[PDB]
Design a protein around this motif. Sequence first.
Motif, short mmCIF file in Angstrom:
data_model
loop_
_atom_site.label_atom_id
_atom_site.label_comp_id
_atom_site.label_asym_id
_atom_site.label_seq_id
_atom_site.Cartn_x
_atom_site.Cartn_y
_atom_site.Cartn_z
N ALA A 160 0.82 -1.20 0.00
CA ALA A 160 0.00 0.00 0.00
C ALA A 160 0.86 1.26 0.00
CB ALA A 160 -0.94 -0.01 1.20
N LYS A 161 1.95 1.24 0.76
CA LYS A 161 2.83 2.40 0.86
C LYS A 161 3.49 2.69 -0.48
CE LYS A 161 5.17 5.74 2.21
NZ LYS A 161 5.34 6.24 0.83
N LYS A 162 4.08 1.66 -1.10
CA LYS A 162 4.71 1.85 -2.40
C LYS A 162 3.69 2.26 -3.46
CE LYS A 162 8.51 1.62 -0.90
NZ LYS A 162 7.77 2.02 0.33
N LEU A 163 2.47 1.75 -3.37
CA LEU A 163 1.43 2.12 -4.32
C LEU A 163 1.07 3.59 -4.17
CD1 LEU A 163 -1.97 0.11 -4.57
CD2 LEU A 163 -1.41 2.19 -5.80
N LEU A 164 0.97 4.07 -2.92
CA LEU A 164 0.63 5.46 -2.68
C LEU A 164 1.75 6.41 -3.09
CD1 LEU A 164 -1.69 7.10 -1.89
CD2 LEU A 164 -1.18 6.72 0.49
N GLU A 165 3.01 5.98 -2.91
CA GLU A 165 4.13 6.88 -3.19
C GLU A 165 4.18 7.33 -4.64
OE1 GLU A 165 7.34 5.16 -1.07
OE2 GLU A 165 8.62 6.94 -1.23
N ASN A 166 3.57 6.60 -5.57
CA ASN A 166 3.70 6.89 -6.99
C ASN A 166 2.46 7.52 -7.60
OD1 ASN A 166 5.83 5.10 -6.21
ND2 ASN A 166 6.19 4.63 -8.38
N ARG A 167 1.59 8.12 -6.78
CA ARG A 167 0.41 8.84 -7.26
C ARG A 167 -0.52 7.94 -8.08
NH1 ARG A 167 -0.65 10.76 -4.32
NH2 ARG A 167 -1.98 12.30 -5.38
N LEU A 168 -0.50 6.64 -7.80
CA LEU A 168 -1.33 5.68 -8.51
C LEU A 168 -2.73 5.55 -7.94
CD1 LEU A 168 -0.93 3.35 -10.81
CD2 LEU A 168 0.91 4.98 -10.37
N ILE A 169 -2.98 6.05 -6.73
CA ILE A 169 -4.20 5.74 -6.00
C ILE A 169 -4.57 6.91 -5.10
CG2 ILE A 169 -3.42 4.75 -3.81
CD1 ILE A 169 -5.27 2.30 -4.77
N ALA A 170 -5.80 6.87 -4.59
CA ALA A 170 -6.32 7.86 -3.65
C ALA A 170 -6.49 7.30 -2.24
CB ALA A 170 -7.67 8.40 -4.14
N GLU A 171 -6.86 6.03 -2.10
CA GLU A 171 -7.15 5.49 -0.78
C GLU A 171 -6.84 4.00 -0.76
OE1 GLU A 171 -7.57 5.12 2.96
OE2 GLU A 171 -7.37 6.99 1.84
N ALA A 172 -6.58 3.49 0.44
CA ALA A 172 -6.30 2.07 0.65
C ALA A 172 -7.08 1.56 1.85
CB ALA A 172 -4.80 1.81 0.85
N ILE A 173 -7.51 0.31 1.77
CA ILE A 173 -8.39 -0.32 2.75
C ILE A 173 -7.83 -1.70 3.09
CG2 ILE A 173 -10.76 -1.02 3.24
CD1 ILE A 173 -10.30 1.05 0.17
N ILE A 174 -7.62 -1.96 4.38
CA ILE A 174 -7.05 -3.22 4.85
C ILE A 174 -7.92 -3.78 5.97
CG2 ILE A 174 -4.76 -2.31 4.29
CD1 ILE A 174 -4.13 -2.04 7.14
N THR A 175 -8.06 -5.10 6.00
CA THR A 175 -8.74 -5.80 7.10
C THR A 175 -7.99 -7.08 7.45
OG1 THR A 175 -10.76 -6.97 7.74
CG2 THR A 175 -10.33 -6.72 5.37
N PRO A 176 -7.54 -7.24 8.70
CA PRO A 176 -6.75 -8.43 9.06
C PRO A 176 -7.59 -9.61 9.54
CG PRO A 176 -6.73 -6.89 10.87
CD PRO A 176 -7.58 -6.25 9.79
N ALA A 177 -6.91 -10.65 10.03
CA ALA A 177 -7.52 -11.82 10.66
C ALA A 177 -8.45 -12.55 9.68
CB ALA A 177 -8.26 -11.42 11.94
#
Lengths: 188, 188, 188, 101, 101, 101, 101, 101, 101, 101, 101, 101
Positions: free
Chosen positions: E18-35
């Motif tokens: 998610a971090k690398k994806l955000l660093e390159n202006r490819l996206i606006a938001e990220a959503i994660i859910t564990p377990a």
Amino acid sequence: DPERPALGILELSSYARGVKVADAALKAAPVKLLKCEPVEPGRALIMLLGEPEDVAKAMIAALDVAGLGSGNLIDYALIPEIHPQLLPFLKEYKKSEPIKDPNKAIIVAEVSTVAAAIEAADVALRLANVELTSMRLAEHIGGRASFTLIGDKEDVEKAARAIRGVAGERLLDLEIIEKPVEALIGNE
Amino acid sequence: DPERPALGILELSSYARGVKVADAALKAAPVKLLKCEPVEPGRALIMLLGEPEDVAKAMIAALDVAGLGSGNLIDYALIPEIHPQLLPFLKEYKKSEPIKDPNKAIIVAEVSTVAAAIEAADVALRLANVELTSMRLAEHIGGRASFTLIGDKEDVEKAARAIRGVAGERLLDLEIIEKPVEALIGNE
Amino acid sequence: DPERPALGILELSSYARGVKVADAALKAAPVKLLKCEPVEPGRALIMLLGEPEDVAKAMIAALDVAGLGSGNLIDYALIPEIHPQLLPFLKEYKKSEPIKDPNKAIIVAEVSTVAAAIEAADVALRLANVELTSMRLAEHIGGRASFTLIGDKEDVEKAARAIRGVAGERLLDLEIIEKPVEALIGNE
Amino acid sequence: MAIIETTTPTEEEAKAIAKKLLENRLIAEAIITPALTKIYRENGEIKSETVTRVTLYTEEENVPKAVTYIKAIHPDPIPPIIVITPTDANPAYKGWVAFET
Amino acid sequence: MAIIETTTPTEEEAKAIAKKLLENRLIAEAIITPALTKIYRENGEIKSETVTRVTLYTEEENVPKAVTYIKAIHPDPIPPIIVITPTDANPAYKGWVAFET
Amino acid sequence: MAIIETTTPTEEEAKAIAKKLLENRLIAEAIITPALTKIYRENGEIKSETVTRVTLYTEEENVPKAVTYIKAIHPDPIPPIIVITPTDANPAYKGWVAFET
Amino acid sequence: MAIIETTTPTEEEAKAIAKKLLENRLIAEAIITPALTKIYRENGEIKSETVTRVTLYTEEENVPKAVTYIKAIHPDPIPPIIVITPTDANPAYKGWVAFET
Amino acid sequence: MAIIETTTPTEEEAKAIAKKLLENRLIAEAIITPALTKIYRENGEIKSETVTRVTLYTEEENVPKAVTYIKAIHPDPIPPIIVITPTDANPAYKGWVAFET
Amino acid sequence: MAIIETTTPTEEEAKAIAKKLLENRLIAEAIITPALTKIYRENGEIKSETVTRVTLYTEEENVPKAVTYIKAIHPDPIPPIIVITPTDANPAYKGWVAFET
Amino acid sequence: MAIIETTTPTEEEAKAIAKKLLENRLIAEAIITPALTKIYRENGEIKSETVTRVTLYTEEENVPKAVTYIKAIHPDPIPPIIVITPTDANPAYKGWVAFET
Amino acid sequence: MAIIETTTPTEEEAKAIAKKLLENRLIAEAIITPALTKIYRENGEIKSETVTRVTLYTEEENVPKAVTYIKAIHPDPIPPIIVITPTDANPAYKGWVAFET
Amino acid sequence: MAIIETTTPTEEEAKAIAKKLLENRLIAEAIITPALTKIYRENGEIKSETVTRVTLYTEEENVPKAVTYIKAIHPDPIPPIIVITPTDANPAYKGWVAFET
């Protein structure tokens, strides 16, 4: 009922619609329902009898609730005085007594709706010294109808011309035969 | 069979295809075939009962051989628990006992396929203190279906809303009547 | 009639037209009429038997009056020698005696017209040591037809190839099954 | 039918919106899932929080209606609403979602 | 717009993608859910693990782009990517997803 | 391909349905998430519970098949099944979902 | 179906071609007629011989096939083959020509 | 190409028509078969004779031409001519019928 | 117009069919040719006989009629009938075939 | 069907035209109404008379026929004929107008 | 052409309207019929009178013109005017109605 | 709207039908004209009587309705009903015929 009871005929494209029509009509007047059943190819056929004014009010309510002009209704009819010969075939198919005269002529009539059939047959029997022989109603034939009559050639042609005049575009096929065979008498 | 046996319904456009489906299903599981016959307008209707898992495997094989998505199949259905009231009308048309209460209301339902009819009727009887009265299945009516129920106005409207919700586009006509006549009681 | 009577089959789009055809044919030759009735979806089916020459003259008159090429006629057929096994199913549906051998194979055939069905079935029974089981004719199915046969796999395939060869474009669906279940034996 | 997807920054507020939505016969069912981390740039800096995600069911005629009410009620000025329409559904739940509304 | 759906076997790796994806202006938001428990047959035996599920937002033009980058970056050789397109969306978030990219 | 969405009132029952579904080569993967609160009116009264939500993957030909089996097996008389079809998917997972079935 | 028409300069050779054609399940029936006089110019001179004419039956799918084999087998370098398609045929022989092949 | 079919009441006359037809480069080949019985009503009485039947080959452009000449030459006032066009033909004989004319 | 093609196993029977066909004003002319050898497999064995071949003329309206009568009269249960329609015909014989019927 | 409309200057003449029209099976019914005042300019002067108006019934096929006869019979050189076609009619009188002709 | 239909409560007034209409070259002919009983409800009571009915002829261009004048002249505030267009007309009266105007 | 045309053999009976028709809100207006002579053949003999003619107004929706009632009420077994639809009508009387029904 009068000796020639008034008969109300309506054929609808829906069964529930026929149900409401029967309910509302029986609200309107104390007429006698003869038959309300689904008929081929899925239509609803409603038959009723009574006094001319009671019949009139029954049709009042029936067409009021039928949604006339919306396409749910296909055809309708009424007759004030049903010729006495019609009545035995009206309730159940009573095969007429065997043919007595061998030199009679015969016709067969075919229509698209039951109302045109019954109206044309009634007028034709009003015409001449002609005898009805058979008739079928809209069952297993997708809402069509047919009937037959016999008589003498000249009044036969007179009746055929009257029949085309009555039926108009609803007529499918009308025909005449002068000397039928013994092998079809009673075996029609 | 369970007191509310699982019921498998499939309607096909071919008779031989229904034959293969029945053969393969009876290979798959030891279910009990209730009926396999050609039905109007030439379709093939297959009915079977058994345990939920045996029924499941029967459908496994049936849809595996049915050529799903090729257009030969039109509609299908299943129900885990058939309401006990349905069962007497399931085998043969058992006309219910005469109406006891005069102030009941009544509805009539019309659909296009047998599966929607049976599913909707089962859910409706799951709903309310309503009583089924009649039902017809796809014979002489070109693969359509209809059924009727009676009850009290408020639960009637509740059931009608549930019925439209279940049927969706497959619904043809749904209706309500508050006070039917004596002249139709038993003469429906 | 000969031990394998000649059988004349014609299906027409009009009922009155069938009436004239029967009348004229019975003028032409002293053949025996087996059935003249309106058939689904409103067609007229005429069946007759007699000597080959009397049958020939009956067809002479029938096609002379039928208005051939005008579209009122759809299909026609004749067979000189009807295989003896056909005759019991010809008059009424006589359900054959229960299946005696469990390892037989089975096919189902579907066509669009009665004439192709009867001709193909006659040729197939002329072929092999195969047994007919059931057959339906144009009633409640809008003028279609179907029949079934059983036998051994190799002659089954031989018969299937012969059947496609006979039917051509009129064939709708032809199929084969190797080992039917006990739950369908007699319950077809 | 359709699906409504939404999030709120605290569980209690999500419960409040769901409660008010249910009180007005606008819906049949409500779906909530907590412990949602939200990462985004803010003035160019990375952030992370813990919020809840909320899913909804209704029929296709009432979707604009619930959308309107959610706009009218949701706390944050710019509120999350996502719409999804299931491809197929069992007749039993079409009946049941009609049921509970 | 569209939706990107993905999973990773550990939370930290999902954060890294998610971090690398955000660093390159490819996206606006990220959503994660564990377990997330993963059950499957392996050589014919049942398994069960604990992983995280990741959801994404973007506009319809950038979907192939994020798909390409995720293929390029994801650790496992055969990586989970699922694509979903919302039927309807509020104009405010269409503007806002255009905003943050 | 497509997506199947379902819920069960207890985790163990969801595990049982997933297990029986996998045993018959009907599916490639199963997805479960617990701790789901269900709020609805019952005779006019508000309710709240804790259940689990279950997500599924398969290809477009096997969707009716899994639907049929889930109907046949699910405990509650009126069972949750929702169908979703992804707009796009990577060729690698199309191959892999074909793989594991 | 169709009709194949051919001639050979001697009866025995025609029998041989018909026999080899039948041995390979290429045909259902063969038709031969002898005592055929062939008149033509050759370097400008009239000629006359005695040959046999051969007629064939098959169905429309196998016509190119028999044509190919006849080309492959016929003795003379430039062999007579004529093709004819009947306008109508009785269903019984359509079945029977399907029969014997 | 096409086929011309004709009959004559004696063999010698058929030979004469074929000879005159060939002399004028109108045709490539001629076909004759004798011993043909002709049965017909004449003033209401049955008859029977013995004649010969003649078959012809040519290409489609020369068919009207041979028809015209045959009309011009045939002895009987009302002469038998039948025209047939083969559905398919081998390229070798298309070349050869072009050859001999 | 059209052409009817048929065969019979003996000459006398062919004469009988032609005679009965002519007696009923069904046709204008009849054509017979004897000495026809019939080779076919029977239970897998080669056969050879001597039969006659019969050709017919009529106009296009009467073709089904003659077909029907031939079916009604021909001795063998499965009788040879082949139909052919000439491409062109001289007006004189169109008139003459109309003539003799 | 249709309607024919006409006038005559005296009642007796109208009766005569109606009588002659009926004698020839041209019509089913005739309609007359007297006491009609006719006002018009004549050389620029106003006039007034007393005439009769006549209405007719027939079916659509016989309309030109009655028109022709009325032209042939009417006294005045330039005779009134007006044609009208009813939009709808009861089947009973369609039958009855067919009846009396 | 067309037809104008009107009524007046007394004969003399109808004569006056017809006279004024004719004086202005607006029309070719006028038609009046007296002794007309008018039955209607008035405040819920049945009535009956004796009036006259008036029919008119003109060509299609002058119909609005006569309508306008009749509106301008007729005594009663709400005056009867009915318009009818004949389906067919004889050329002689088309010429004659053109004549007298 | 439309027009209904009818006749009765006596004036009083026509009045009775009009009265009963008006009592049931089926119509707005009724039109009667007496002194009508009816000439027809009867067993081949000419006849002449004196009857009355009756004209009717209504709107297009109520035409079948009045037709039905007139059939139900008229004395003679085969009763005169003719239907006519005006081409144009003034808005004032469209309003007024709507008025009085």
